[PDB]
Ligand binder design. Structure first.
Ligand code: FES
Ligand code: FES
Lengths: 74, 75
């Protein structure tokens, strides 16, 4: 059994700051702690920070996304 | 007088990037960063984990409002 398609255009961000036409975050590395973990799935309730929402998203959708970690060499 | 705007979906976010990796995580030491690093949050960049402007076309096509994460040196 085969099948065709069309133009769905699913959004990545479903609910965060929808009054902002393009969500961009900018941080000075000098004011970060020893570690910051940033969300790349747009499902975190602590956006722009990762709260572990990625896990449920990957399990539900079969995806493989995860966060960006900025840290001091240590 | 009441109506909702439903945007919920069960679609994957990352369509094509490093699918042999079960969970794509990047970790960088700030001491090794230059003046400005711009990281992709849309999973459409051909330079992932870095932003290449793919988010603009995604936003246009889908009506989305995603954009990158910038880590920079204080001015
Ligand atoms: S909560 Fe989104 S990448 Fe972890
Ligand atoms: S290319 Fe993905 S956020 Fe810019």
């Amino acid at each position: 059994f085969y099948v065709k398609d069309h133009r769905n255009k699913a959004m990545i961000n479903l609910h965060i700051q929808k009054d902002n036409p393009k969500i961009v975050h900018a941080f000075d590395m000098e004011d970060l702690g020893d570690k910051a973990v940033y969300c790349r799935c747009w499902r975190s309730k602590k956006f722009p920070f990762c709260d572990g929402a990625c896990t449920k998203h990957n399990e539900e959708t079969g995806d493989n996304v995860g966060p960006l970690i900025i840290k001091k060499k240590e």
